[PDB]
């Protein structure tokens, strides 16, 4: 699956953030509230399993990782939903004022500006810490999608408080914390 692409588990749709690697093996990271629901993930609702969960953390954080088990070696890119893709080649933390994009499977690519970093967000399940607030529009099914700027991976889509027009509220989990948690790098 490419970054921003749909993934299905537990009868729900989420989105993948980025393809990552360690030890010559391929994995994708996504939202923890998505990997909490299921161990097996497919690229269509009743499709064959492409990967199995190897870790998850939600609430407190919101990230998780799925190991590919179907023998594929996907490109390390994010789907721009227009026939093309964005190559990702590094990861960093977002900064206030930075223009970002997110790609997820419900609203495809939307854009916004980072308004705050290191934010605690209270969801119904509990608080998630050290989050990033943006003005990018989003909707259910977009969690786990890629927050990025050019070839730089910045975050994993977690949630929002709504959107009207272009004025969104997409919140992301910093991707660097998930990459260190699992000892993985983007490629």
């Amino acid at each position: 699956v490419l970054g921003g692409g749909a993934i299905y588990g537990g009868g729900s749709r989420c989105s993948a953030a980025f393809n990552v690697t360690k030890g010559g093996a391929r994995y994708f990271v996504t939202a923890g509230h998505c990997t909490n629901i299921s161990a097996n993930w497919s690229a269509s609702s009743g499709g064959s399993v492409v990967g199995v969960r190897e870790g998850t953390s939600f609430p407190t954080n919101d990230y998780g990782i799925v190991r590919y088990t179907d023998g594929s070696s996907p490109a390390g890119t994010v789907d721009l939903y227009n026939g093309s893709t964005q190559d990702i080649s590094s990861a960093a933390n977002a900064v206030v004022g930075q223009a970002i994009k997110k790609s997820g499977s419900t609203t495809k690519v939307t854009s916004g500006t980072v308004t705050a970093v290191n934010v605690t967000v209270n969801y119904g399940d509990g608080p998630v810490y050290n989050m990033v607030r943006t003005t990018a529009c989003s909707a259910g099914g977009d969690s786990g999608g890629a927050h990025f700027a050019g070839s730089v991976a910045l975050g994993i889509h977690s949630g929002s408080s709504g959107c009207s027009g272009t004025a969104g509220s997409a919140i992301h989990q910093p991707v660097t914390e998930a990459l260190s948690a699992y000892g993985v790098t983007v490629y």
Binding site: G141, D142, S143
Partner: peptide, 4 residues
Amino acid sequence: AAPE
């Protein structure tokens, strides 16, 4: 805010 809600998870999406």
